[PDB]
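[worker-b] picked up task from shared queue
[worker-b] task type: protein-ligand structure
[worker-b] ligand name resolved to magnesium ion; SMILES cross-checked against name lookup, match
[worker-b] sequence length check passed
[worker-b] input payload:
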Amino acid sequence: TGPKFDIDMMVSLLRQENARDICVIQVPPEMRYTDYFVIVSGTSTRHLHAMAFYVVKMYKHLKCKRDPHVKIEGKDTDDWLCVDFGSMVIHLMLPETREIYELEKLWTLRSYDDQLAQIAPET
Amino acid sequence: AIQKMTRVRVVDNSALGNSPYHRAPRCIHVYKKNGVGKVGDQILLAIKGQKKKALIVGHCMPGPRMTPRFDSNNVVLIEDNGNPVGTRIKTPIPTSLRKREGEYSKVLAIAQNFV
Amino acid sequence: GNIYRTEYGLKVWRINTKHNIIYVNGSVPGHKNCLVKVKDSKLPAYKDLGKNLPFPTYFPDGDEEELPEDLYDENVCQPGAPSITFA
Amino acid sequence: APWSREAVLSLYRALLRQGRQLRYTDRDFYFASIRREFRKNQKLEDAEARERQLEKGLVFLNGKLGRII
Amino acid sequence: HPWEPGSFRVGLIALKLGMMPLWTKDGQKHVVTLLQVQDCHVLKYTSKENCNGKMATLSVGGKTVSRFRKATSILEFYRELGLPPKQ
Amino acid sequence: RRFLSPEFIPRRGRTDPLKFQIERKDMLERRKVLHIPEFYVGSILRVTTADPYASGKISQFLGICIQRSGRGLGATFILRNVIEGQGVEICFELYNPRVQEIQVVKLEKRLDDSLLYLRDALPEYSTFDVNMKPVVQEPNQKVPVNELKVKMKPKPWSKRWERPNFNIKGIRFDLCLTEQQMKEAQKWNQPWLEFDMMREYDTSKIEAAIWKEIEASKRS
RNA sequence: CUAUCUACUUUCAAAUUCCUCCCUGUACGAAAGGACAAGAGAAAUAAGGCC
RNA sequence: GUUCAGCUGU
Ligand SMILES: *P(=O)(O)OCC(C)(C)[C@@H](O)C(=O)NCCC(=O)NCCSC(=O)CCCCCCCCCCC
Ligand SMILES: [Mg+2]
Ligand SMILES: [Mg+2]
Ligand SMILES: [Mg+2]
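[worker-b] inference finished, payload out:
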């Protein structure tokens, strides 16, 4: 009875919930945010809310009392949901919103990202 | 730190923030009972003739020890639903936002530098 | 000013047995080098926690292992402890 | 040809090689996303700009700033 | 006697030395006041009946002070007790 | 030449001396765990701390020291740097257990004991490379005094740095202030202040006693 | 108010509030819907103090 | 002439 809630568990849950484009980024310790960065696409707003609760429902089950509780953010929005567990941050975004922010490039190319090269979204 | 009429600097790459305007962005309302805005506090701005929600990511007023104090009062523009208007933040933002009460994962995700 | 006031519910972080110093949370009324009356907290939450405190008082003459120079609270970072990490 | 046409082609093969050892990231998504950057965003450029894109790709390949699992 | 629910033990008189920062393992800072117990002794005991109160009373004394600046009546009380006068 | 950290020397007041002895004991115990190096206002430091908000991940901030203030366990220093064109200052607590290391990248003294005017100076004077390598300090040599005089930005400044009360010597006033502005500042000059003997605070005897405590702790 | 008179110059210290989490997707609920206190954290205000 | 920008214990 010792299945901890780790990155391997979360990706399993996400794949079980039909995550379209799972992208796990290993954030180095120098970047003082999280150990892992997860960006998942969803078919619709209803899908994002469902898989967001399922991961938090499973986390609450497979967590110690000392471990802090987690809050699902972005419920007011329909396109983008994010859950900051503490060692993993999972961002659930719709396909169109995911392209706009290009979070994969930012967290893999911290200071070399194209948008951070003064290519601002004037659109 | 930030009050009504306080001029603020937009540190995101949003078109609204970076567009040239004769009037500098000014705080018109602070979403706190005391009307005093700190880091991690939402405010309403008068920017380019519009009313846009913003989040305070840095201010000149000294805060607690071990926390960064900035030369300017820095804000990031957010939509009514909490999404950030800009896609990137190049100005260093404090890490205390992560554990401050409220929703800040969206802003932290687009932040290039932490201090 | 110059009147008696009470600060209720101040926790004892640390005790110095050698110098008989009580480290109490926050601030107490009065100037430094003034005499203060210290008493068990009367607040309802802190009622009946004297079960583990010296009763009627602490007698160092009594037969017990001599207390360490400093007594600390479980959460207090002691001066000679290693630098803390939050992992 | 930022530094050489072989370097860009060498980088493209290198990144694709990494995409086939992805434990968690969807390999289909990784390959398509890599294609889009090389095929469209950076295929047609100028001499000076080309160098920045190659340095960006090398930074992505090393993974010191961030790695894709 | 052993401690029983509903018991109220005595307190003490301390001198306020000053304030110091204290840190906890969760990374929070706490300012504390140093209270030093100087020549604190029990001086008098009064039973419930004689005290005109529900609870008995214990009189406690604080810092030692000069005998040359105290009233004769107070000086006579401490003479019987065998302790220097308190502030 | 032996340097006594400024926070050990207490400020004038009615505090019982025992309170300082107790606090100095806690300070010396923390110094055994963490090496606090000798540095001054104007020196470049890199401070490493464990981040509570990032699950204890270590953070490094490099900046010039512009202020050293406080006494006892709470003593602090402010480091200033310009990151991505943004001026940032952090007030660090020397004895905070979060601090993992305090490294002196460059050891020097500036013309002033405080460098708060750097906020009003050109950004270059506050910009230091975060990856700069420590310069070696020659053994048994006097701390070098940097005599740089900074050029200021157009007024108004945060404070009236020209006024005599600040007694600043590291600003090129001639470049930014006219002769009339300089003379107007002298109005606030208080020539008698430097000759007020009763205001003097002599800590020679106090520092000597502190050194005995510092030596005793090292021996044991 | 250059304040003569009346009154008054410590009713000493029981505290309010909004949010987040939790309880809980639990009691109820045909079902949807969805508690209440119990708590936890974070804010602000007020009162009292403190460096 | 305003707005704006700027400064101020208003
Ligand atoms: P061919 O005709 O032999 O050669 C074609 C050439 C190379 C000549 C042509 O493409 C060209 O002129 N290119 C210009 C320079 C160039 O191509 N530079 C390489 C760009 S490197 C690059 O784009 C790296 C991208 C890094 C970010 C990837 C993000 C992936 C996210 C994955 C999420 C799971
Ligand atoms: Mg000012
Ligand atoms: Mg007050
Ligand atoms: Mg104006």
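[worker-b] attaching auto-annotations
[worker-b] Chain D has one domain: 1-69.
[worker-b] releasing lock
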